[PDB]
């Protein structure tokens, strides 16, 4: 294990006709990748490469803020003949699989240990009714409440589970900067697992699903409009962004090829034809001797 | 040193003369759980010779149209010998695995197998939302077959399976592959009956063939797995 | 109080910003760190791992057929056997590789590539191949006389089953771009071509139609820049629980 | 790193660790392969 | 190469009638500019000049914030009978030629290496409809997403390319200060080139255009209104400003005379008559002996 | 928290502000610096380079005709040959120069100018000219008796083909302004005039009608201040891709 | 030292007696690419005498109405001698150029040429949006003619062309001009066939004239260009 | 003045934040501390009962 | 310069470099021209 701030330098190489030395030949059967250097495969010049590697660090590769949740509910009076339930909120059931870019990028490793910075971005639209005159978006107070595993969830906007005496909650308005906080590495294990070759229950029943991990039960995010209902219908759209920090990554995986279909498992249907079809990942060319983008003069 | 190897664990001793090397997964050898990493406070049972020895599983016929085979550890050895009994009688297990795949053919035969140790290999099923059943996932010593080896049965690629600890059996060069697996879990111990740390997969990348008088030759593939530094915690009745 | 002026960039959310934030779980004790084997510190470690290429990406090969190249005994001499496009950005043999998939998360790249070919015929089957890397400028070579003039390696089959060809970093610019225009000077790497040096010779007892598997990796002089969302994966809706 | 908060996990992106050991994945063999040597 | 914080001082000079010394005569044919000093052309006094030069530094000359993009789209429901495309965004295809003041100023050098500070200034107007009652501009959330070369571009406001898990994106509202960030020197070469005497493709076809540089393929800026459509039509105008920082400049050019016509090449039509006509750059005067602004008493 | 008061100038975008900003590409490695010849550190280096003047900016000269002054053998004596307005801000011979174009990006200027004239007749053609810089106050001279009383140089043609006249910094104020009012005390530099000292004498074998090319540059005592958008370039719309 | 100059590169030697000086573009001399600035890792071919020598191009008749001529480097020398072959056979080139323009006339003749080395001279076309075709831009050793020399065919000015490395041929003073060009590119090497670093331009600022018996005199303009410290990388077939 | 940029998390109320705040009763003298038996420092002391 | 961010390219306008070498453009001649001397 050596320090690599810049890519390897190239050393000047000479003609070499030596018996018993075959640097260009390797045995792939050992499981070892070819160790052949350019210096010993061709005649090379001295090159002092000052290309930096900091952008290919797993901290930089995974430590960008990515969307992990998009939920939209109608902000209005949901009350009817006999309901008494205001329903101006949503519950998510925390996960990192709903959006494929962060999922596929996280799924390039088996295990990840990171503290996560979260950023919530709310947006309002007036609901296009029969008689609706627009004149501006109310500066509503929102409450995002993390309900951990085994805590009572809210059933209404007006519920008293919103007390949040011990539940972590953040209050933030529409016209303010998007809410932000850091959640620590909060697994019962020493790393998060993107794949579980097993079951999360002690029973052998169908109801006990394959792939579900007994460390991904992370609880729920409950977000409400704190303001009581307006005289008109609004649509609140909430976007939650995840930025992994202080990242450790283990056991790199084969990248996902087929499009995801759900968040409970890694099943696939594949696309009808190449690319990313079950029988053809790379698009077809005419023959093994055909260059599809051959430069013609 | 050479292309010859003898593996000796307890009662067991395997010899090969057409070897390539020993693949130590992530350049690590299995070791016993230290105190600094220990969670379960009860004194563990460390049966060396009775568990840490080569268990040979039932062989598989390499066919011209063979898609490939996988064995999930420790599920493959959970109903075999004293490793099985210690699993049945304990809540928690920890062990590495020395896996040794064997395949004999003539100098006139051609064919290549990729032998992959995949950690936390979650099987994806083609053309359904329903996740794989207990039966499909837990096949024990008999192991399972690849339906989509091209996709590693994961919606991933066979192409990129070389990230994983692997060797090849190329009948030109090699009749045997050897992969040393260390403990691979986010936790120090686990429940053997409901989670598999590793999946040993044997995929034919180049098919088995011969010339005019070496076609339809009976060529089996034998797998021998040795638990390494096996530990058990939570002595109870047998499950 | 502290004299204050809110600048441009105040009240903005930048997805690539590097700032400390309010801890939601105050005085929370995270699980003790435990040693796990195969720890990755850099994406440049993964692109250095060999991965198979779909050299046989044709509309007659299905699944595992696409990762092997059928090499046969020729009733001819000097003939071209197969080609490899080096357009990582475009749908080609290098796309679905560790190099391809992870480099495809970036826009700029520099450094030498290694491509290793494993022969998978019989111990009794012999042969000599010539694999050539043609730097860009003109058309892909179809005659061995033209290909031999570029960077090449002559491959003798034997106990060492594999050969490496180093595709050396030969470009005017410090970096190339993963551009949708393959014929662009910024993007084009050139051509890899394989010809028969002598022939494939197999005795009657051995099959005449053998196979070659091609692998590609990056060398230690390899670099990536300007991270981007990979075009490998797409999404038309929020992924549901079931469907 | 800077960190204006009490907890250490609240801090910004960690100080760049440029340590690389690709041998874990590229040469994970018991007996090391020597450069130029026939590796049989 | 000497340090010049203040302009050169003037030294007192005397009468000089010396044979073999002709400081006022030069040879222009050498390519060298005249080296004649005022001290040796006329009788001068001692002057201690304390005029500073910091304002004529290329850092100061180029390092002002200049407009580089002005795009306006209609913020409304673009949906029809069968569209399902919201179209409340634009894509620019990054360049520095659309606006002539920054173009002509940058085009005074062949090569430039600078890190660039960008500032985005959004503005809303209510669309003048048949029945439109104004009462105030909604505080909309905007997303500017840099889509690098070879990345999937968004086709709609509601597209999932906006994930931006690895694409650099900035979220900023209307009533906030204008968004700002620094893009680094991001050329595949050691400097940006304002002119390319060549082609960017290996083919010799018409489609391969002259002047296009294979280092100016800088990707695209995609900017969206994050908020879903309002009940009324708004017009969002976005202004992007560029401030070069840490500037190095090489090979000074002849300044542009003819008005620019496009951003793909440096072609010209010229103005009908002087000034800046193809055959007359400077305006006409009656004769070579005529002073047009002659002071008369 | 840190006690804070948002001052006037908070939430403002000033196009001339000097502040650090959020990096969009975190830990991005820019291309290594490479030596390129002709590096410019100051705009004052470019105004010191000679550039041709349109002395013949008349409605009968087209293109390259405008950058040369037709000097002929005179059937007279002491006669004026050509004039040069020194109104950089106004449409005059100095506008389309390196001095003009780059100084025209500023509002204030100070320092001495050099104007070099190259004679382009025959080796056999002789002559003596007198170029005079008249400081401002009154009318431009039309008689040599009046012009000779100001700063001047007498030019003998010979092996050294060019002459310099230093237009020396002669102003009450430390700076002059590039003002639209030419007759303003803040703006006016005065006049440059060229008369025949003797005559142009060419033998029969040589052409009688020769040419003079005038160049102008700044000296090391030259300064510019108060940057502005140049009036040289205009725009009626966003420049399209094609038209 | 004087007004006399001998240039000696390989086989070649040029002498002049009516010189002015040598113009070293941006006060620099061409040198070989160092390791600190090197990109292409293959060992470059440095043919000194076979490439770094004076190639004399076809002459041009200086007319009373001559607008001017340009030659784009390396395009002018890409189909000439061993410089051309090394270009045709390699992907990458790097070289400086010693340019030497020659024009003889009598002491009775009058005329002045500006000889400009313009870096990255992108030709602008008058009265169209269509960019210049491959034919119009790539004319090789024959070179091209100025349609709008007043505008440097760029929408710029001939007036301000003295920023660029330049000399004059004033028939009074000078019969020859000499400009030393170093490597001018944002990259250390480039592809010769699709990009020109330099454009050598010869513009008559003052027209060619004589008196009564020296009119309509045949006065050619000869250009000799010597590649300096030529390097080539990416040995392939010839294009 | 002091150069300032309001970040994401500005103007937010987090129920688990740890910041000093404006004292409502300036220079208020709280009642002197008096010893009371059975002082609890940790909830882990009570779960051990 | 000040810079509140990790990257060096994020910093404000660089510290004034008052180095001038106009000879690059004004006297780019092999043999230097001497002041007052006939430069032939
Ligand atoms: C797998 C996997 C899962 C994770 C952790 C994801 C973090 O989950 C969240 C998210 C996305 C948001 C909040 C959150 N947002 O707001 C609040 C608050 F308001 F309660 F503070 N909490 C809390 C958690 C644990 O990391 N890997
Ligand atoms: C020629 C030439 C081109 C350039 C660089 C121009 C910078 O281009 C931009 C611009 C103008 C804006 C953004 C940008 N604006 O917002 C975002 C973000 F939101 F994605 F962060 N990126 C990114 C780049 C590369 O410098 N010289």
Author numbering:
A (entry chain A), E (entry chain A): 7 to 303
B (entry chain B), G (entry chain B): 10 to 248
C (entry chain C), F (entry chain C): 1 to 243
D (entry chain D), I (entry chain D): 28 to 67
H (entry chain C): 1 to 49
The authors write:
Enterovirus 70 (EV70) is a human pathogen belonging to the family Picornaviridae. EV70 is transmitted by eye secretions and causes acute hemorrhagic conjunctivitis, a serious eye disease. The capsid of EV70 is composed of the subunits VP1, VP2, VP3, and VP4. The major capsid proteins of EV70 are organized with pseudo-T=3 icosahedral symmetry, with VP1 subunits forming pentamers around 5-fold symmetry axes and VP2 and VP3 subunits forming heterohexamers at 3-fold axes of the capsid.
